[PDB]
Amino acid sequence: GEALEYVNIGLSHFLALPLAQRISLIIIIPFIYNIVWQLLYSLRKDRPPLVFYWIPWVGSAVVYGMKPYEFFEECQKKYGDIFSFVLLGRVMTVYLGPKGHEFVFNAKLADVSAEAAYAHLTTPVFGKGVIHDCPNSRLMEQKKFVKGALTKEAFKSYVPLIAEEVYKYFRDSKNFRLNERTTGTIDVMVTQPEMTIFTASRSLLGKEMRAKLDTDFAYLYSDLDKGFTPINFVFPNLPLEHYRKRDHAQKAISGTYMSLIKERRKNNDIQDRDLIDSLMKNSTYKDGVKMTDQEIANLLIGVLMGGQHTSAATSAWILLHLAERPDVQQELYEEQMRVLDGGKKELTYDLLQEMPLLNQTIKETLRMHHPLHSLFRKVMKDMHVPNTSYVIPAGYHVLVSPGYTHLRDEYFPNAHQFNIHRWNNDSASSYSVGEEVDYGFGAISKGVSSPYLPFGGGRHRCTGEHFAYCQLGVLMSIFIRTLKWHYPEGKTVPPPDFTSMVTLPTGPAKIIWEKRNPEQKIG
Ligand code: HEM
Ligand SMILES: C[C@@H](c1ncncc1F)[C@](O)(Cn1cncn1)c1ccc(F)cc1F
């Protein structure tokens, strides 16, 4: 009773402490509070173990962002395959391994949302109305629109254009100019992004859109390029300047696409050339709405942008791994001479399919260097993980990471050794190992239990797998037949830089190239 007066009294003296002790208690009450909250949380047996952190809110973000596969391995040894950690205000429950791939890539639409996790990151860059700034059902239909331009007949015609672009680059780039140099050094992280965007542009976007890249316009891609960073997860729209040249470039680049979209319909200049022709002819949803010309341009940005960063990272890794392995280059070259009749057969999408060792090299690189170490979903409903007393409460996030499983000896013997022969009689981009399902964009595998899942699975599954292998196929067939490359003295494979949007190599990652035929000229 008389004590009740003194909780009151003490509350008044609390308010009248010096700014030195108030400030410090501002930073000790929450620190001491979250340490004692965690301790209570670990007695909850319907929750997966939460890994201890000191700083509240920040959580474990520092070690997760820097070495996420080392973090995952350390957590796996302590608490098994399921565990939570807090990440800059959110709570992520990792499910490692194939049962984890299944728990997350085959989750019900009712249980998890990818849109809910990524809309803050994608929509500022791509524009609105597409990808994650729409309902999952719109997403499924957009993928059906894009995927309707990623056919075998499309792929037969992209191969001469892609190959033209590779040669034009060897001819004209300051990094090569093969008609004036026979040897040189390139930074793969400078060359590979440029090659990707040229080849992707010319093929999917058309010749006009490829043409604009030879000009100043190219910088808008570079400006747009920088708004695609995990920082948009914390400060999505933060009134600074790289946020404006980002948005400037979005408006600017989406304008060029609509200008072309609009003039093509004005002229009925609508053929089967590029994905711009395709999305024009076929972008009406199942309920009857057509995509606005701006929505078509923003899907263009998002598709080109995402495939840009994964494809460019992958050919970088193919070069860096091969730079160290002249025996694999020798092997890949023999297959080039055998399949292409010593160079006296033009490269075709068909002939690419007969090059298993090349396709096995892409396959193996993508095993060791998955471009997305972590995929996320926001949990919408309380989720129960079977064989288990755990519930993942709504508002948590689930995190699948097949790239970690990729690097496990459990599923890949000597997982840390680059070995393309681990895929003998198995050069497939991927393989639907049984029964299939359709979420709107075509029949894809129903199970998602494979330990090798470079293109994920389920509804959010990649619709650019076959394009990626095409691009990477021509690019690497031509690199192989034209150049030998090795590392500078002392140099080896760089470690991955996980902090960016894709695990790309820690730069600079340089290789010395030599012409196989010094006296050869590109016409
Ligand atoms: C080496 C190349 C690529 C790799 C390794 C890769 C990997 C992936 C993965 C793992 C996902 C699943 C995302 C998630 O589950 O959260 C995905 C989604 C997707 N990717 Fe790719 N990707 C590649 C290239 C491309 C290209 C070139 C395109 C376009 C031509 C593309 C378009 C898409 C689309 C449209 C989705 C659907 C996302 C969704 O439905 O939520 N990707 N990709
Ligand atoms: C959202 C994005 C992503 N980026 C980084 N970490 C996780 C991610 F989910 C991604 O899934 C990645 N991606 C897959 N293939 C190409 N890019 C994506 C999907 C569709 C798209 F049109 C553009 C795009 F970037």
Author numbering: 9 to 531
What does the paper say about this structure?
The azole antifungals inhibit sterol 14α-demethylase (CYP51, SDM), thereby preventing biosynthesis of the essential and fungal specific sterol ergosterol, and resulting in the collateral synthesis of toxic sterols. We have used, as surrogates, structurally aligned mutations in recombinant hexahistidine-tagged full-length Saccharomyces cerevisiae LDM6×His (ScLDM6×His) to elucidate how differential susceptibility to azole drugs is conferred by LDM of the C. albicans Darlington strain. Phenotypes and high-resolution X-ray crystal structures were determined for the surrogate enzymes in complex with representative short-tailed (voriconazole) and long-tailed (itraconazole) triazoles.
The ScLDM6×His Y140H I471T mutant provides a surrogate X-ray crystal structure for the clinically relevant Darlington LDM mutant of C. albicans, and for the LDM Y131F I475T mutant from the phytopathogen P. pachyrhizi. Similar crystals of ScErg11p6×His Y140H I471T in complex with VCZ formed after 20 days of incubation under a single experimental condition (46% PEG 400 pH 9.2). The VCZ in the double mutant showed the same configuration as in ScLDM6×His or ScLDM6×His I471T in complex with VCZ, but was slightly displaced towards H140 and more towards helix I (by ~0.7 Å) than in ScLDM6×His Y140H. In contrast, both ScLDM6×His Y140H and ScLDM6×His Y140H I471T in complex with VCZ have no AO, but have an open SEC of a similar cross-sectional area at its narrowest point, i.e., the opening bounded by the M509 methyl and H381 imidazole nitrogen, and the F241 benzene ring and T511 sidechain methyl is ~48 Å2 for ScLDM6×His Y140H in complex with VCZ, and ~49 Å2 for ScLDM6×His Y140H I471T in complex with VCZ. The lower resolution (2.9 Å) of the ScLDM6×His Y140H + I471T structure may have limited the observation of discrete structural changes, such as the location of key water molecules. In contrast, it was not apparent how the Y140H and I471T mutations interact to confer preferential high-level resistance to the short-tailed azole VCZ, which appears to bind in the active site in comparable conformations in the Y140H and Y140H I471T enzymes. Unfortunately, the structures obtained do not elucidate how the Y140H and I471T mutations interact to confer enhanced resistance to short-tailed azoles, i.e., the double mutation maintains enzyme function in the presence of the short-tailed triazole inhibitors FLC and VCZ.
